[PDB]
């Protein structure tokens, strides 16, 4: 995994495009990947 650079990313099947940065927001223990009000992905947890 490479962050801070515009890369093609895919985690378990999300298969999106974007640059990944370390995020302040905290997930729930079970919740895997977040989303925004516009149904666009905004935060993902690395499975590893």
């Amino acid at each position: 995994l490479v962050k801070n650079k515009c890369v093609n990313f895919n985690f378990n099947g999300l298969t999106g495009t974007g640059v990944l940065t370390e995020s302040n927001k905290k997930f729930l223990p079970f919740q895997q990947f977040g989303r925004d009000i516009a149904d666009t992905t905004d935060a993902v947890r690395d499975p590893q």
């Binding site: 925004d36 516009a38 666009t40 905004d42």
Partner: peptide
């Protein structure tokens, strides 16, 4: 008074400080 899928927003030519100055 109170992400990108191709669409974008452009900043106004007169920013809020310049509009306040006007």
């Amino acid at each position: 008074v109170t992400k990108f899928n191709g669409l974008t927003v452009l900043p106004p030519l007169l920013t809020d400080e310049m509009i306040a100055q006007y």
